[PDB]
Design a protein around this nucleic acid. Structure first.
Length: 132
RNA sequence: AUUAAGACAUUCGUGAGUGAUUUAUUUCCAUGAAGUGGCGU
């Protein structure tokens, strides 16, 4: 019966019929322009293996890639009026840590495993999961 | 039938023990039980 299942989508349903804003993770080079090998036979890299031509990442806006200010992996993106709308991961999801026990009242039970910690996530109000 | 299912942050636990509303302080200071005699030169 089931033939095709689309990847799970993050959909923002705000108000009215309007439209569904499909949210995607930010590509790992959002505002970074990578400038690969200027072919001059020199300055290669060994990626645990064979030749690879020395990526050069610039802030696409010069300096170089500073990894102390790299946060494209904490962002989610959606279609805009010719610019990318960036939403932080912690705004989409809310995290909760739950303490759980077994009251164990009785008389002779061994209190040996009566404690656990559970992480529960909550999607923001105007956010739904969807797939085809 | 899906890295699922199942599980009270619960059991025990006195806001309690010690502790003078006590110490210091004159109901005292001033003050006359006193004044006058009267009647017929």
């Amino acid at each position: 019966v089931i033939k095709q299942i689309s990847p799970l989508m993050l959909i923002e349903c705000k108000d009215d019929t309007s439209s569904r804003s499909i949210y995607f993770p930010l590509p790992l080079d959002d505002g970074y322009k990578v400038s690969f090998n200027e072919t001059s036979n020199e300055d290669k890299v060994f990626y645990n293996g064979i030749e690879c031509p020395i990526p050069n990442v610039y802030p696409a806006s010069r300096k170089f890639f500073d990894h102390k200010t790299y946060n494209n992996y904490l962002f989610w993106c959606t279609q805009g009026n010719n610019q990318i709308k960036k939403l932080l991961s912690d705004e989409i999801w809310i995290s909760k840590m739950q303490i759980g026990i077994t009251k164990h009242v009785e008389e002779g039970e061994d209190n040996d495993k009566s404690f656990y910690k559970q992480e529960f996530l909550q999607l923001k109000k105007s956010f739904i999961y969807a797939f085809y």
